[PDB]
C-alpha cells in the first residue's frame, strides 16, 4: 500500500471537479516573507488520512497586489498544501522567481503556522508557476533537485536548455501565446529536458498567454494528476497521464509515457 494515497479513487469527473474531496482552510502570510513577498496557504482540513505534500505556486499577474489564486482551492481540495505567492509582473525574472518559489517552500517547512506545519510532509514538495514563474519552476528544479514535481505554465525563459533537470516536469503551453511563444519557449524547454525524465507537454488549443490565470478544467485535471502521480507517488493517477490525454481542448500532447 502507498502511504501517500489520499482521497477516494479518482474518476474522470473527480479530476475535473472544481472542489475535490477535502475541505480547505487558508492562512495569509504577509510578515516574515521577504524571500517571496507574501502569499496565501491553502490546506486540507482533514487530518485522518495523514500529512500532505505541498506545491508553491507563482502566478504571472494578480490584480491589486493580491496573492489568492484559483489554483489554491482547486488543488488543495484534492489533498495538497498549496502556497500561492505574490507577483510583480513588470519585474519578475525566472531565476528570481525560482528563488522565490523555494523561499515559499522553505517557509512552509520552517516557519508556517502550526496548523499548516502539522499537516505537511516536508519531504514531498513541488513548484508551479506562470510565465516568468513558469521559467522559475524550471530554475527551481535545478537549484533544488529534491523537489518531487514541477509544472511550468506558459513558461518564459531566455535559457532554453534544461538537460540537467532531475524533477518530473509537466509544461503547459498556450498555442497562440505571443508573450512566451511555444515555438521558442515551452517546446524548446520540453525537448531539452532529458529523455529519461518523466515529463509531458500539453498545448492548449486556441489559448493565449493569460489562459492559466482563469479557471481551466483541462489545466486543473492534469495539474492534479501530475501532482498526485509525482508528489504522492499515486499511480492511481497514471491512467490519466499515460497514454497521452486526447481532450478536445488539447492541440498537442507529448510525453515520455509510460512512467
Ligand atoms: Ca540552461
Ligand atoms: Ca489549434
Where does 30-143 show beta strands of DSSP type E? 39-44, 52-58, 81-85, 120-130
- Please give the annotated binding residues for Zn(2+), written as ranges: 1, 5, 12, 48-49, 73, 139, 159, 161, 175, 203, 205, 251-252
- Please give the annotated binding residues for Ca(2+), written as ranges: 31, 33, 36, 159, 161, 175, 205, 251, 253
Resolution (A): 1.1
Query: What is the CA(190)–ligand 2 centre distance, in A?
Result: 19
Helix count and strand count (H, E) for the chain: 8, 9
Query: 131 near 156, Cβ under 8 Å?
Result: yes
Calpha distance 225→145 (Å, rounded): 21
- Listed by start position, the domains of the chain span 1-259
Calpha distance 130→63 (Å, rounded): 15
Where does the chain show beta strands of DSSP type E? 24-29, 39-44, 52-58, 81-85, 120-130, 149-153, 169-174, 199-204, 250-255
Nearest CA among 209, 218, 220 for reference residue 60: 209
Residue in the block written with cell 501517500:
4
Cis status, amide bond into 73, omega within 30 of 0: no
Query: What is the CA(87)–ligand 1 centre distance, in A?
Result: 24
Calpha distance 96→89 (Å, rounded): 12
Nearest CA among 154, 145, 113 for reference residue 126: 145
Query: What is the CA(210)–ligand 2 centre distance, in A?
Result: 16
Amino acid at each position: 500500500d502507498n502511504p501517500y494515497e489520499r482521497g477516494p479513487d479518482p474518476t474522470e469527473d473527480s479530476i475535473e471537479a472544481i472542489r475535490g474531496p477535502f475541505s480547505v482552510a487558508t492562512e495569509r502570510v504577509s510578515s516574515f516573507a521577504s524571500g517571496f513577498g507574501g502569499g496565501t496557504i491553502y490546506y486540507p482540513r482533514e487530518t485522518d488520512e495523514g500529512t500532505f505534500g505541498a506545491v508553491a505556486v507563482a502566478p504571472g499577474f494578480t490584480a491589486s497586489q493580491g496573492s489568492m489564486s484559483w489554483y489554491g482551492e482547486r488543488v488543495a481540495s484534492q489533498g495538497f498544501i498549496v502556497f500561492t505567492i505574490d507577483t510583480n509582473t513588470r519585474l519578475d525574472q525566472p531565476g528570481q522567481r525560482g528563488r522565490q518559489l523555494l523561499a515559499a517552500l522553505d517557509y512552509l517547512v520552517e516557519r508556517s503556522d502550526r496548523k499548516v506545519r502539522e499537516r505537511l510532509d516536508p519531504n514531498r514538495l513541488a513548484v508551479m508557476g506562470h510565465a516568468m514563474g513558469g521559467g522559475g519552476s524550471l530554475e527551481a528544479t535545478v537549484m533544488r533537485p529534491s523537489l518531487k514535481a514541477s509544472i511550468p505554465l506558459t513558461p518564459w525563459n531566455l535559457d532554453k536548455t534544461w538537460g540537467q533537470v532531475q524533477v518530473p516536469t509537466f509544461i503547459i503551453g498556450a498555442e497562440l501565446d505571443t508573450i512566451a511563444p511555444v515555438s521558442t519557449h515551452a517546446k524548446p524547454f520540453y525537448e531539452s529536458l532529458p529523455s529519461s525524465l518523466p515529463k509531458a507537454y500539453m498545448e492548449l488549443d486556441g489559448a493565449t498567454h493569460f489562459a492559466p490565470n482563469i479557471p481551466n478544467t483541462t489545466i486543473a485535471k492534469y495539474v492534479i494528476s501530475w501532482l498526485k502521480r509525482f508528489v504522492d507517488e499515486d499511480t492511481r493517477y497514471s491512467q490519466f497521464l499515460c497514454p497521452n490525454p486526447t481532450d478536445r481542448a488539447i492541440e498537442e500532447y507529448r510525453s515520455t509515457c509510460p512512467y
